[PDB]
Design a protein around this ligand. Sequence first.
Ligand SMILES: [Zn+2]
Length: 157
Amino acid sequence: PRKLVPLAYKQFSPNVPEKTLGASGRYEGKIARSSERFKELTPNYNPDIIFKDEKNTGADRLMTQRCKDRLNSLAISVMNQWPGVKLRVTEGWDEDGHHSEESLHYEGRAVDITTSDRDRNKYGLLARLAVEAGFDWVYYESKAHVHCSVKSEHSAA
Ligand SMILES: [Zn+2]
């Protein structure tokens, strides 16, 4: 076994920009509810993940399959790491534009996460778990959350 080292505040892994091929790839444009690419999104109803749903639309559950797969892996790891605690998503797909111009939140490929107990002391390690769970980019973005993202299925040629 290897010792798990938490990410530092503001650290990202891999240590390259989010939208590079070695990380989460490219911004492929906003997905609107009315758009064809809306079917790229699938709702995650994993019983072991808490969704904040702060906008009361259920949008934070809607994500790509790869995002769902990595998130579900992380959900198991979080429960393992801190028995009694669960993975919590505070932001997923954003229909409103509350991030930078080319956010992967706009296309259901990024989540902001915490632990269910909102213990900010856990977030560095939570970030490390997200890396081990196979998220393509993980960024300890604020003291209040970790930003995790995935590649699309449109770069493999
Ligand atoms: Zn984010």
